[PDB]
Amino acid sequence: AIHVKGQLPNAHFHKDWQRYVKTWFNQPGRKLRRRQARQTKAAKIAPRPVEAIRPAVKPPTIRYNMKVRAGRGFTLEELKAAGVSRRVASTIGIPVDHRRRNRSEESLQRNVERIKVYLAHLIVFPRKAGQPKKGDATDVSGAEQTDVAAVLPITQEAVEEAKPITEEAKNFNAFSTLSNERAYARYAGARAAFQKKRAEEA
């Protein structure tokens, strides 16, 4: 039994696990299958890009909010600011995320510029060859299947370079402010209860 040096065992192997073992011998076969499908799709949908353009969003947590990643689609407000109709966007390959919204002008301007670059670099073939109408390319001979990642990647905010040390920064106590603000937040409710109770008594 247990008489040897090391951890106490924890092997969750009391069910019939051998029936449900999963091996990965098809790992290269799955990898090759995905590529052939990927190459089939690219040839089927050419000249338009294989992967649609995605917005740049911020992950929702203190652990990841300092990074910039790709979202699902551009919000209705962003499209309206960029001048793209909601119906047209899905036709020319701009995903539309109705659920998302822009709480900050920083994110709105980020994605609005993103759409504007996409529109400037976009070549739209006429529905009937030879008659361009409104948004429509007059010359489509030079169209080629490129990558949106090459045209326009998701760029993280640049790390701020050196800046001078001000006197208002010199006379600033970081640790004291942190502890004071933590205590201020902690007793915010008790202070309000005291103030209201004193007010009714008065």
Which one of RNA, other proteins, none interacts with residue 137, CB within 5 to 8 A by kind?
Answer: none
Residues 151-170 that bind RNA (CB under 7 A): none
Q: Long-range contact list for 120-126, CB < 8 A, 24+ apart?
A: 121/151, 121/152, 122/92, 124/92
Q: Does 180 bind RNA (CB under 7 A)?
A: yes
Site string for RNA, 21-60 (x = CB under 7 A): -------------x--xx--x---------xx-xx-xxxx
Q: How far apart are CA 119 and CA 1, in angstroms?
A: 71
Nearer to RNA, 54 or 114 (CB): 54
Using CB under 7 A, pick the residue from 103, 144, 158, 160 that binds RNA: 103
Judge contact between 59 and 69, C-beta under 8 A. Answer: yes
DSSP state of 54: -
How distant, in Å, are the alpha carbons of 12, 85, 167 from that of 7?
Answer: 15, 62, 56
Which one of other proteins, RNA, none interacts with residue 148, CB within 5 to 8 A by kind?
Answer: none
Q: How far apart are CA 92 and CA 85, in angstroms?
A: 11
Residues 151-180 that bind other proteins (CB under 8 A): 159-165, 169-170, 172-175, 177-178
Structure tokens at 10: 């924890």
- Residues before each break in the chain (C–N > 2.5 Å)? none
Q: Is 105 helix (H, G, I), strand (E, B) or coil?
A: helix
Q: Does 172 bind RNA (CB under 7 A)?
A: no
Site string for RNA, 105-144 (x = CB under 7 A): -xx-------------------xxxx--xx----------
**Interface contacts to other proteins, rule CB under 8 A:** 1-3, 5, 8-9, 61-64, 66, 77, 101-106, 108, 159-165, 169-170, 172-175, 177-178, 181-182, 184-185, 188
